[PDB]
């Protein structure tokens, strides 16, 4: 009924709210601290911070905090990416107040006790371990660290050698410098904005400029290669995409989809996916491949991902490239761009068809722009992309510094010079 | 570990706003894109 | 009294001998299997092979082998490099025969038993761990896998993921293909050649061509960077040296020494080392640096090695480069080349002033050339290097594809584009 | 682990024939250049 309601304060923190109909409300304070905010000496402290969200803080002991949310059947999720760190908080309409006072403690009153922070430490390994089970995670990670040099090439997961060495002052300093007013965006899905503000005003007023971590962007072509014993091999090939919320970017997104192979059908094969077709024809029976597309504030990464077998690695890899070369040679007919488009549009909508989805989308936008762009407008922007534009962007991959990351038996994985 | 032998493979990463988003929650836990 | 005595047989295995005066005799069968002989599927096999020297074999049980050499106070060393694998065997004049029969079983009659090979396995980790304690080894290893693509890029230590996966048919295969007649060279430091030959003839006649592993060379510039928590940082910068036993090579060696900083004085600083001087002047108080020089059959690696602290990494790294650029700009006076030369010459002679040294030198030569070049001759060759020649070589590092490896806090370590 | 604080550092690798030669012997054991 009532649409969202943004409001930038004097501090510069953003806040939104949507009194929805249904029974479930969810706050989420998104602080601007991603993994790109750590240095050589600070690496792995966001990771630990992410995992220390239930520790004692100034008003609420670790015990109260967890038993408290249990009391009421809430959930407290602490999500992070290379650029941001969403602190989610779900619970029943009637219990938001009990819950909010928890989110506030957790975020503005953390008390990292030597003893408490010390117990955690080992959790990092356990966490890292489970996430590194998906080749995607280590390759994807390795990708970022090869393509960047300084900031976005920092991974999400603590470096093995740092684990036990993440000190209390480190956590306290990261909170202090990054968990600040200018970088924050409140976001409610079932709360009163009037009452939200009040609270935001009372609890979120802290000073801290950007880049006390060492903010800045830079792309650097590089290749990280991980040999294994596994039959299958994964590899990424990516060159500087266009930036976040910019036209070029958007273009990329649309091109992405022309090749992009995320199956829309269970047990179904893509007929739409060029990459898949092309790859497929020159490739063996079992394989899988998809267009990769990343966009961040101050740079992007666009290019594709492959999953071949030991002796097909190259064939696949090249095949994919060649095909994306085709579009950059100009060869791309109108029919396919419009399908792509509609694919993308559909996607975005579904993406925001959920509370959790919406709440992410909103916060996300808060941190980038400073307001909420409605869907419609969104939709218009994507449509504006020119059928040529797409090609043009694609031209850029082929004529853009390469950066690749592979895993598995790498006898048959092309190097930079190979392609 | 889950065997990845057939056509079924369909994993590769690329979302709208979020990219390689790792969650750690008090209750659940995971890795998306 | 009697000088060595080489002899190539119909098989193509070389054999030498020097009845010396002194009490201690040392045989050593050098088989031509280095690390470079394994594939993606066979990596780590020489390593295990190297560690499995005391296992049961066809004529002597692991127990007899060990207890036997102990009986007499003998030593059995099994040394390898990227190109070769020297199987040394020391003992008392009188006991060569008991010992030789041991060397022959170990090498021609290995019996890798599922159970025995299996209990070894864990030793690989223990061995890798103890050699990875010197930054030099992991960097120097990282260097070779960055700079090569295929063959010499293989490391001497088994890859973590392979350890327990080293199977008995692997060991059996490796021996069979590589531990053959054409690739072998017996070498005695206190044995009769007449009696040596007989034995050689009776026990070393096995067939096996080269490259059933996949022989071939290739250089590829690349950078491997390993972040740490250690104050100090080590990095290596190296371009395709000249090949083994060729003029260019030799030139490199002389050049190496003009900059080469291997202290000749305890607690003493080099006055001679240009690198050190130049580095020193632009560098801080504590630091150390030296000229790196590697030469193999089908390729080489020349350049330097640095050890700086966090913030000084670049300054030192460039400093060192700049200085080697100087020599490449032409700036190098006669007086320094002759010093160099004499330095080299003195070193090679001291290298061979010991039994162990001599024995290595000799076998080494037998796998390359096919005969023993005497010292004198050696000495002549190094002298033939032109003062220009050196410059010219140097010109080649500055104008040759770069390839670097570093470890430690890499905030301040130049990349490829940095220098 | 041995502390490497002072001027003493003098480790860098480069020999004549042998380069990075790793020994494994029945009795002793090591890593040279």
From Swiss-Prot, chains A, C:
The modification N6-acetyllysine is found at residues 32, 165, 216. GO terms for cellular component: mitochondrial inner membrane; mitochondrion. One of its GO terms (molecular function) is metalloendopeptidase activity. Gene3D superfamilies: Metalloenzyme, LuxS/M16 peptidase-like. One of its GO terms (biological process) is proteolysis. The keyword Cell division does not apply. It is found in: Mitochondrion inner membrane. Its main location: mitochondrion. The keyword Acetylation applies. Coiled coil: none annotated. Keywords: Acetylation, Electron transport, Membrane, Mitochondrion, Mitochondrion inner membrane, Respiratory chain, Transit peptide, Transport. It is a peripheral membrane protein. Component of the ubiquinol-cytochrome c oxidoreductase, a multisubunit transmembrane complex that is part of the mitochondrial electron transport chain which drives oxidative phosphorylation. Belongs to the peptidase M16 family. UQCRC2/QCR2 subfamily. Component of the ubiquinol-cytochrome c oxidoreductase (cytochrome b-c1 complex, complex III, CIII), a multisubunit enzyme composed of 11 subunits. The complex is composed of 3 respiratory subunits cytochrome b, cytochrome c1 and Rieske protein UQCRFS1, 2 core protein subunits UQCRC1/QCR1 and UQCRC2/QCR2, and 6 low-molecular weight protein subunits UQCRH/QCR6, UQCRB/QCR7, UQCRQ/QCR8, UQCR10/QCR9, UQCR11/QCR10 and subunit 9, the cleavage product of Rieske protein UQCRFS1. PANTHER family: CYTOCHROME B-C1 COMPLEX SUBUNIT 2, MITOCHONDRIAL, METALLOPROTEASE. This is Cytochrome b-c1 complex subunit 2, mitochondrial.
Curated annotation (Swiss-Prot), chains B, D:
The gene is UQCRFS1. The chain holds residues 46 to 78 of 274 of the full protein. Component of the ubiquinol-cytochrome c oxidoreductase (cytochrome b-c1 complex, complex III, CIII). Subunit 9 corresponds to the mitochondrial targeting sequence (MTS) of Rieske protein UQCRFS1. It is retained after processing and incorporated inside complex III, where it remains bound to the complex and localizes between the 2 core subunits UQCRC1/QCR1 and UQCRC2/QCR2. Component of the ubiquinol-cytochrome c oxidoreductase (cytochrome b-c1 complex, complex III, CIII). UQCRFS1 undergoes proteolytic processing once it is incorporated in the complex III dimer. One of the fragments, called subunit 9, corresponds to its mitochondrial targeting sequence (MTS). The proteolytic processing is necessary for the correct insertion of UQCRFS1 in the complex III dimer, but the persistence of UQCRFS1-derived fragments may prevent newly imported UQCRFS1 to be processed and assembled into complex III and is detrimental for the complex III structure and function. It comes from Bos taurus (Bovine). This is Cytochrome b-c1 complex subunit 9.
